[PDB]
């Protein structure tokens, strides 16, 4: 009457209530599948055991015995019926097994060490303006101080070129000079490059305090194509699963270079357990990287102590899909389930009570470290001054 | 021997070539689906005749007759053996035929109209203030100038010329080569040194007002948003999968939705797709069609592409190809789907059918050099100007 | 010689511009809801319609009221007063008048070189109504759909320049004159 | 079998369906009142037909027949037998008929026309700085010019005290004059002040786009002893109501002095309904005013054309209740219905679903009338250094 | 025929006289219950005899034993025939008792201590920067005004003052009386200039951002905060309505407030609303007691008004006054209470009693004096010496 | 005479300031999780604690790694190694002591004026590169809870304030025998 139900506890899918030892029966294993399950059987109408398997694996097949492992083997070889659980659907375990229709959306996806926050760099000031401003103010610079040269040496009413680039510089930082045009023309060049100072450096002057005090995370892969190219950076996957399959059945070049890698990376990068990958992540100083599924990665970010982050996309989507054994008159029924839960919104109710609602994770004083880097500018160009005035006293004395 | 496929005309997963009278048969139709299907039978081992549904209806069922309409009727009474269409999964339509796995994921989703995009030209700092404060600056500046020429001079080097540069400094901040040494010129100095200080200061903070400011608002922005609104009318595509589904929901926000839809004058469904999309493109934003997030992807990608997503998908689905229950191509069908999706297949169409046509390709960011293009172009005018009144002046004293 | 000529002319080009504006109809572009809203080309004084029902009959207008009528006395009140009297563009006409005067009056009495002085006087302050007069035009007209301005708004912007530079111009004469008296 | 159930169309309590003529039974009445009725008739179990009051009055006494009006005569006179309404608890009522525990609170209220938006007015400027700071500042310019003044004068190394509050001036500005110091205890005075400037302007103009283009909203009157002051506004209340009632018999000195307006001020301001108080408002260019319970208030403001607000808080704190003929069987059971909907929470989601259900109701350029006052300024300075020149040239001139 | 009158010691209803050892008697008792029950008799015509609950506890039912506790307790058993006290009014008290009409109103509110102000000094003008900025400025400054004395004098009016002079007023952007002709001087002055411009630039900026900011972030804001966060414990007062609230509610967010407080270690049920206000106030910011509203807006008004309410209240109810089943003092209670609510007599209380005592007084606004009178002080200072100087200067000229 | 004394006793006063700033340990006065965080005085080269299970005892830093090691040659690995290296104080102490041995030599070759001009560039040189040690100090410790500053601190400081008050009375005295010189 009652019917084998395999899980494995991958949370938050399933997983071990709070002082389970005073807990006996199917109230023991709370989570998103047992819930599932639940619903299954009530539409359905039977009654479930759940179960969870020795081996701990999800599954796969050893190409020299033929032989399944996991939840596969387990429905296969009659030692259950079905498996309401996280796995993922491929064609491998369709030839063997009755797959539902998919109850949750995935992809593989990359999972890194969150890096410490990129304080903000030396010359964060000329971030508010694109660097071809700058170069187009630099020009600007120049060619307003060369035609107020030619003006005011071809026709005066004095602005030589060292003195027409001071007065030009003044202008520029609204320091006045000394001395000021007397001509039209001149007067005219300088009233366009004050209001163009004024226009600048009000732009400038709005948009300075984000960029001073703004810290970018960036990671050293952005994408897949970024992991391949790095090999210092170790990537491994799940021993038995659908990933390492899915690499190792692969004839894209990327996953096929991948594949390689993984077969001769030693030591082994790949793991036992979701958990095992997880802290070797967190306890490898961003020297290892962890292939799995999205979900995974999206309840661990949402979850402290939130040392963790998830790069890039989906490399290959699919889906998480009940089985049950070949023949099986519950494999008719469970779809149906599955579709009725589907449009009722249930899926969803559970994706977000489990993920959403489990989430665990201002104008601030300028720092000096902020804007260090023109005290150095400032310094350096004292020492530069310096010297300049000791190479003119030499030449002189000579 | 051939088999029958039944599709529908919807862009892009089957579409008419050009010129498509001159051509005929398979040859003629082009989609996603086309390539799909020929994708299917050459990992069957079978050969296949495209056909259309006549009706143009996805599927449905009258419960009054208890009879299907549209791919799914075709399907179920024998009169095409496969539906290579974009057939979403349902419970329903799933009783009676039997659907293979999915191979493309959608949702339900919000299409309104692209708003104005108020897009900024190369005299966009001139933005902060009225072109009628600007104006009204340049007559008060003379005004100034020729009343301190005035005080200075009738019974000194505030000449009218030199009084013009006097104040156009004051106003830039620049300083003065000289200063007024009279009470009334000293007057006339700090009224316009007062006047240049608010403004100045007035153009400042509306400019780091502007520059911390983006056009991000949505209309609706949510499932209630349309609920709440009566303004702007929306509705579904008539015999389609979410007409059902707001038929048969049982949550408050859905429940309104059916209620409206169902008691909508005029009537807000829609016969096809395009009709919804041009109602909403000639709605002047009072029309919001609800559809799947596929269709309205590719709109808001294919020109004019003046449309635009809003909201997240209310559910989540996927397409799913079919065949009539009890046939035996459902068994290898299901493979060879599979088998696409872990050979990047469906990725490659997917990207290929919606990305690479790109009709068009639409925190705090640095400034561009087309933000302040203008202020340069005056520079150069001024810079040219100058060189020409040199040029003039040169002439003037040779003579 | 010629540069008082020069004045005469230009002060009462800027009287008739200034007057014409004053009495012309075409000050303002802008649809409303005074004509079965529609294309209307207004001025300082009475609103005309176009391309409308009327197709050419227009009235005055009731500035203080503007169909409110409420808030007396509350600063806004004397800005709506200022507008409907227009009383700073007549004045600004009234002074290019009586400075235009002084300096034909000045042929007549060249010794008196003060005449001419009490005119560029005259012609400044006319430009200070006039810049005034069109600021209170446009605050008022606030109490938002598309807009534009016509040929008349022009026109009393032409006067303003041309007095700005007959001041100059005056107070140079006066500047030459009392130099050659020495 | 069926109770006799009175209410009165006062929305959003009671209000019938559009296109109602095709309407039968109780169907035809939707509202907050007509629900409440429905769950109270369903935990006592009794059955209600909805009635409404030809009279379409509240409730209130003949100070000369020792007459009852609207709902209260009706249930005294045995013409029904409950009223889920809301009609509002009072002591005279009481002593008549049996009332149930509130189940909404409410205050009377005042309601008037929504004043147009204060475009921001002329002076404008001097709004991000207190009044006080102005006068401190002069005060500061007229002491550093002083002390300038003594010092250049006492101990020179010319600054007279004109071109001391000069030069005071133009560092306010940010304008540099022709003189600096050269002495250096005038250094150090302006040295601060500079300093000074430095913060004042850059407080000023930190905060200065705000005080420019907000419109601010502001009522004649904003209590009920202004209300009671300013005799040209009128005031006035429903004809039959708690309000009136209250008014009358009230013994403070400004209720008293309302009463006796009221009793007075003719045409009578007393209205027959709500709405019709409610049209007088909006149709009265701000010159009326309508006294009522803060619920009707909270509806309408919320409601378009939301051409009205209320002003105020709430004179006095009353409650809507329930009430019944005396002796009557059902009184006893409607409280512990009453209670028992407090605790679920039943009404709080009915106020909700009637009151916020129904709600109805940016960077702009500057405007030329925001900133006309400096430009008058501007003007009236230049008139002022005309004239100030004249006389001077006549001065001379003797 | 004295009626006893069943009371409880709660703050500010009833409280004890200072120095109540020598008092003795209801002249011993002082808060807003007492003026209520004097007015009532008062208005009905009798004469009352307080008496305090012995247990402390408002009342509840043991749901084993069925038995009435607390002052709902002695008003079942016959002990006393009148509860003035602050018994908020449900349906389970409803039943055995016969309430009054409310004569004050409330909710289910949150209480925190209260968090640190951080309020603004004189010297407020210094926050967008660093003291560590500011005083390398003032090295900077010395360092560069020195290196243009030196490059412009050894083989000119830049001596050593006349340098820290310009460099001054440089930063302050009030301009020179002279500027560098040499190479040297002018790379100094440049660079000097170039450094003001970004220093002045990000002060600014920095300042806008301060004055445009407000410490409002509220821990909680909500009753699903609570529920959410767990570093922070909320618990309420044994033998109080609101734990049967709690109870009996069939909500989600009060059936997992009610599973956390039942199932909370240490517990957080208290003894006493005064426990629960010390637990909060002594707890750094980790409990977060339960009350009605007016006991929590009371002590936040109340020295050291270090607790802070937050939230809306989460349902309605009120305070009544009560009476044995079938007692014939039910009917004439009613009728007072109305009149006091009618004749402005409950609402002089409520203030009196809440707001009188004022222990303490806790969308642009413009500026405080208080914000800048730093400057201000800095500024005499300066005058101040400026006068000392020229003093000191006066005696070495004359000598 | 006198001035060329206070310049030499004024640099040596730095020089001792200076390096008893670099040698001493009681710059920063903050708490770390370093020792059984707790209240620590550190310095420029070791880090010591105080009122804590060791209550004297202490040894130097890690500066380069920061138990981080990660992020090589990135812009901030540099200034790890001027902070551990301190290489800029040190300088500063350098110049100082040459900057006083020139000026004690001036008092040996009366007529080679120059050597007290390189003498106050020195001064002025270690000026800067002691204002430069102390932001690279400060921006270093940034990698918030309370802290604060030393006496070694501000020996530092005063070290930086008097060679620049050498340097201007070196350079006078240079403008003054050079005048003499005529
Ligand atoms: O009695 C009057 C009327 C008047 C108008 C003006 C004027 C002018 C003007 C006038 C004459 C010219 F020859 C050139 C320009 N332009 N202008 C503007 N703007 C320019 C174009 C507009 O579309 C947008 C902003 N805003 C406000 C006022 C204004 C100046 C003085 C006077 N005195
Ligand atoms: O080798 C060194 C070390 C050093 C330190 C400094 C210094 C001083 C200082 C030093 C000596 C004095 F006599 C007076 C002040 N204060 N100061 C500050 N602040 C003042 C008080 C602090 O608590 C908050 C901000 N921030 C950063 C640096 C700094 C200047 C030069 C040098 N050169
Ligand atoms: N349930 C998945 C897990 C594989 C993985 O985590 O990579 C499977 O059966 O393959
Ligand atoms: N229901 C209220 C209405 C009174 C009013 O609106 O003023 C009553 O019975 O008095």
Same mark, same amino acid.
């Given at each position: 009457?009652?019917?084998?139900? %395999? ?299 939130? #040392? ?50 489990? &989430? ?39 | ?62 419960? #009054? ?78 005004? *100034? ?236 005018? &001024? ?17 | 010689? *010629? ?34 809203? &529609?294309? %209307? ?78 005119? &560029? ?62």
């Amino acid at each position: 009457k009652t019917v084998v139900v %395999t899980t494995i506890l991958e949370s938050p899918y399933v997983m071990m209530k709070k002082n389970h030892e005073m807990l006996e029966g199917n109230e023991r294993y709370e989570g998103y599948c047992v819930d599932l399950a639940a619903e299954i059987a009530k539409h359905c109408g039977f009654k479930y055991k759940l179960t969870i398997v020795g081996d701990g694996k999800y599954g796969a097949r050893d190409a020299d015995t033929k032989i399944w492992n996991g939840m596969v083997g387990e429905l296969v070889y009659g030692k259950a019926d079905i498996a309401i659980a996280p796995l993922t659907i491929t064609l491998v375990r369709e030839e063997v097994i009755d797959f539902s229709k998919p109850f949750m959306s995935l992809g593989i996806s990359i999972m890194i060490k969150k890096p410490q926050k990129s304080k903000p760099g030396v010359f964060s000031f000329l971030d508010p303006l694109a660097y071809e401003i700058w170069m187009c103010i630099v020009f600007a610079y120049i060619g307003v101080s060369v035609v107020l040269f030619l003006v005011s040496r071809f026709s005066p009413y004095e602005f030589g070129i060292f003195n027409s680039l001071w007065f030009s510089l003044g202008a520029f930082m609204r320091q006045g000079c000394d001395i000021s045009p007397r001509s039209l023309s001149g007067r005219i060049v300088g009233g366009v490059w004050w209001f163009f100072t004024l226009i600048i450096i009000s732009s400038y002057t709005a948009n300075l305090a984000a960029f001073l005090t703004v810290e970018r995370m960036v990671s050293p892969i952005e994408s897949a194509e970024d992991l391949s190219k790095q090999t210092e950076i170790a990537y491994g996957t799940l021993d038995s699963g659908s990933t390492k399959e899915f690499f190792r059945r692969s004839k894209i070049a990327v996953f096929d270079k991948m594949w390689t890698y993984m077969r001769s990376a030693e030591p082994s990068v790949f793991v036992r357990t979701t958990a095992e990958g997880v802290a070797r992540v967190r306890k490898s100083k961003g020297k290892y990287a962890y292939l799995l599924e999205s979900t995974m990665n999206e309840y661990i970010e949402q979850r402290k102590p939130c #040392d963790t982050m998830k790069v890039g996309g989906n490399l290959d989507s699919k889906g998480y899909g009940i089985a049950t054994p070949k023949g099986s008159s519950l494999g008719t029924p469970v779809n149906l389930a599955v579709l009725k839960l589907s449009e009722q919104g249930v899926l969803d109710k559970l994706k977000n009570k489990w993920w959403y609602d489990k &989430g665990e994770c201002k104008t601030s004083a300028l720092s000096l470290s902020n804007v260090a880097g023109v005290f150095y500018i400032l310094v350096g160009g004292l020492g530069l001054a310096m010297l300049v005035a000791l190479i003119e006293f030499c030449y002189k004395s000579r | 021997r051939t088999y029958i496929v039944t599709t529908i005309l919807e862009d892009p997963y089957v579409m008419l070539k050009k010129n498509a009278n001159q051509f005929e048969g398979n040859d003629r139709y082009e989609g996603y689906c086309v390539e799909l299907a020929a994708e299917i039978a050459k990992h069957v081992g079978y050969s296949y005749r495209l056909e259309i549904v006549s009706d143009g209806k996805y599927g449905a069922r009258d419960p #009054d007759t208890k009879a299907w309409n549209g791919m799914v009727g075709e399907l179920v009474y024998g009169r095409a053996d496969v539906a290579v269409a974009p057939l979403t999964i349902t419970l329903v339509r799933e009783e009676v035929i039997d659907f293979s796995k999915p191979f493309m994921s959608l949702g339900i989703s919000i299409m309104i109209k692209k708003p104005q995009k108020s897009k900024p030209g190369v005299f966009s700092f001139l933005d902060p203030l009225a072109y009628e404060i600007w104006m009204c600056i340049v007559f008060a500046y003379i005004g *100034v100038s020729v009343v301190l020429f005035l005080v200075s001079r009738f019974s000194n080097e505030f000449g009218i010329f030199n009084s013009l540069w006097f104040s156009l400094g004051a106003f830039m901040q620049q300083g003065c080569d000289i200063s007024p040494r009279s009470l009334s010129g000293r007057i006339v100095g700090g009224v316009w040194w007062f006047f240049t200080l608010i403004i100045i200061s007035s153009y400042t903070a509306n400019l780091a007002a502007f520059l911390t400011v983006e056009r991000m608002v949505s209309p609706i922005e949510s499932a209630e948003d349309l609920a709440k609104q009566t303004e702007i009318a929306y509705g579904t595509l008539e015999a389609g999968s979410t007409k059902e589904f707001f038929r048969r929901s049982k949550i408050a926000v859905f429940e309104k939705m059916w209620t409206y839809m169902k008691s909508a004058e005029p009537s807000v469904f829609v016969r096809t797709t395009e009709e919804g999309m041009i109602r909403v493109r000639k709605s002047k934003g009072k029309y919001a069609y609800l559809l799947e997030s596929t269709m309205n992807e590719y709109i808001e990608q294919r020109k004019p592409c003046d449309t635009m997503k809003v909201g997240g998908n209310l559910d989540s689905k996927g397409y799913g190809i079919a065949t009539p229950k009890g046939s035996a191509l459902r068994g290898p069908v299901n493979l060879a789907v599979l088998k696409l999706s872990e050979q990047g297949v469906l990725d490659k169409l997917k990207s290929k059918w919606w990305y690479d046509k790109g009709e068009c390709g639409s925190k705090t960011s640095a400034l561009s050099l087309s933000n302040v293009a203008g202020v340069f172009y005056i520079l150069i005018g &001024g810079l040219g100007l100058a060189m020409l009144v040199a040029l003039i002046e040169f002439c003037y004293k040779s003579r | 010689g *010629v540069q008082v000529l020069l004045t005469t002319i230009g002060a009462f080009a800027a009287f008739g511009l200034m007057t014409i504006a004053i009495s012309t109809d075409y000050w303002l572009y802008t649809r409303a809801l005074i004509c079965n809203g &529609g294309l %209307t080309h207004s001025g300082l004084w009475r609103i005309c319609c176009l391309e409308g029902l009327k197709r050419g009959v227009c009235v005055k207008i009731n500035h203080f009221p503007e169909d409110t009528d409420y808030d007396h006395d509350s600063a806004e009140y004397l800005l709506r007063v200022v507008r409907a009297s227009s009383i700073f563009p007549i004045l600004s006409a009234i002074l290019l008048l009586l400075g235009g005067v002084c300096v034909a009056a000045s042929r007549v009495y060249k010794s008196k070189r003060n005449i001419i002085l009490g005119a &560029g006087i005259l012609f400044v302050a006319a430009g200070l109504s006039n810049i005034i007069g069109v600021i209170v035009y446009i605050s008022a007209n606030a109490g938002k759909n598309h807009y534009s301005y016509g040929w008349s708004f022009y026109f009393g912007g032409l006067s303003f320049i041309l007095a700005e530079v007959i001041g100059v111009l005056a107070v140079n004469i006066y500047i030459e004159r009392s130099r050659e008296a020495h």
